[PDB]
Design a protein around this nucleic acid. Structure first.
Ligand SMILES: [Mn+2]
Ligand code: NA
Ligand code: NA
Length: 327
DNA sequence: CATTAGA
DNA sequence: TCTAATGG
């Protein structure tokens, strides 16, 4: 957690770089297990050798470890940090839509800069166009203050369209968080569950409405189950206009809301931990259900969920407010 | 790990 | 169809 910091750290610096700038999935995969292990190790690694003893630890990484233990640096790392080409891929990637592959290819052609990206808006598809368009607003965090207004609005139209709609803005905002990155609404409806062969419209209707009023300004991707866009709060009695925000809405078969709802709320740890517990408590939990465990090794039979509680009660736990789902 | 764009 | 990018 701290004893092996610089280590796992440089480790990751490395691994990442393989996978992005290079297409060394493996080496990339290597630095990670390694960084994964050394991370767990209970003692101050003093040298390569010591390290080396580890599973995942080979001669290469080990080798690096020394150089870094000896000198508070690494050349390879020092070179890569410098390398513009590689600096470039690191940056382009930040565009919503730009992946590595693409990051590289642009570079290839010579698109390195943000402006470059501009003079060639043509080479870009919608996603990346909008991504590049809202580059600024996309990097900024979402003040809860705003988080509250947004949530407000979404709630209303949803109810406005059909009253039967159930919606929950999940994630960190849900867990109290003073700020958020994008907003995630989980949607559902009674008329839609596990069996009942869809109602794509279900998702559609809402999207349309949010648009109607001018909440959703653009569509990044919309399918019959997961919309993915941009929104903005009505810029008041002017002088201050809102930033373009990322938003995602997903339809959910009512007989799997809470689990999913549980889930997306996290935290990442709380989840796992809760997850680890239901296991002992004779269960299994996943983004959609919770099946009582059977001794033959495994078992199925999805339990009946009506609220965050049911799941709790299931594994026999203390209902935890979202506020305290911290871990 | 699963859902959408695209080519 | 596969392959990329997002999320989570
Ligand atoms: Mn979020
Ligand atoms: Na070894
Ligand atoms: Na990106």
């Amino acid at each position: 957690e701290t004893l092996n910091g610089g280590i796992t750290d440089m480790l990751t610096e490395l691994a990442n770089f393989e996978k992005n700038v290079s297409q060394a999935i493996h080496k990339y995969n290597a630095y990670r297990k390694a960084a994964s292990v050394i991370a767990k190790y209970p003692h101050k690694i003093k040298s390569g050798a010591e390290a080396k003893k580890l599973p995942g630890v080979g001669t290469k990484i080990a080798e690096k470890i020394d150089e870094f233990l000896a000198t508070g640096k690494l050349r390879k790392l020092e070179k890569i940090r410098q390398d513009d080409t590689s600096s470039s891929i690191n940056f382009l990637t930040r565009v919503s839509g730009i992946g590595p592959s693409a990051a590289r290819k642009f570079v290839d052609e010579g698109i390195k800069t943000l402006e470059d990206l501009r003079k060639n808006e043509d080479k870009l598809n919608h996603h990346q166009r909008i991504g590049l368009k809202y580059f600024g607003d996309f990097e900024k965090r979402i003040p809860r203050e705003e988080m509250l207004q947004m949530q407000d609005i979404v709630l209303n139209e949803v109810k406005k369209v059909d009253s039967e709609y159930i919606a929950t803005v999940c994630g960190s905002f849900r867990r109290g968080a003073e700020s958020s990155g994008d907003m995630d609404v989980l949607l559902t409806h009674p008329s839609f569950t596990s069996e009942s062969t869809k109602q794509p419209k279900l998702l559609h209707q809402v999207v349309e409405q949010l648009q109607k009023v001018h909440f959703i300004t653009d569509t990044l991707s919309k399918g019959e189950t997961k919309f993915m866009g941009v929104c903005q709060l009505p810029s008041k009695n002017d002088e201050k206009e809102y930033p373009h925000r990322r938003i995602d809405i997903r339809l959910i078969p009512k007989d799997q809301y809470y689990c999913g709802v549980l889930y997306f709320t996290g935290s990442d740890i709380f989840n796992k931990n809760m997850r680890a517990h239901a296991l002992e408590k004779g269960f299994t939990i996943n983004e959609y259900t919770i099946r009582p465990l059977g001794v033959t090794g495994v078992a199925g039979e999805p339990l009946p969920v009506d609220s965050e509680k049911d799941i709790f009660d299931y594994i026999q736990w203390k209902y935890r407010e979202p506020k305290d789902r911290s871990e």
